[PDB]
């Protein structure tokens, strides 16, 4: 693998190595996979995220 390609770049694994085990860090990972698209921004700005 070359890590300039995959959906998980380097600073995703840099987050997992530095977490506490709190269940607030579980929902951080699901909130981490927002896709930075232009019609993704319509979804959060509607829901005020």
């Amino acid at each position: 693998m070359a890590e300039y390609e995959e959906w998980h770049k380097s600073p995703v694994a840099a987050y997992a190595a530095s977490c506490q085990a709190t269940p607030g860090a579980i929902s951080a990972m699901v909130s981490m996979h927002q896709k930075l698209s232009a019609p993704s921004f319509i979804c959060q700005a509607k829901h005020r995220m």
Binding site: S18, C19, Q20, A21
Partner: protein, 49 residues
């Protein structure tokens, strides 16, 4: 620093490196400072005890 008494009758001053933060004495790095310096080691690494 210390005094080196070996040559002849007089001494001369020499020096050995302290090599650590902990080899600074307690008047110049007290007990509650080394405790509050390792609690800053904890907040950056974010280690789990």
């Amino acid at each position: 620093f210390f005094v080196h008494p070996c040559p002849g009758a007089r001494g001369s001053y020499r020096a050995t490196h302290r090599t650590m933060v902990g080899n600074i004495p307690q008047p110049l790095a007290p007990r509650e400072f080394q405790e509050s310096r390792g609690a800053q080691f904890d907040a950056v690494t974010n280690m789990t005890h």
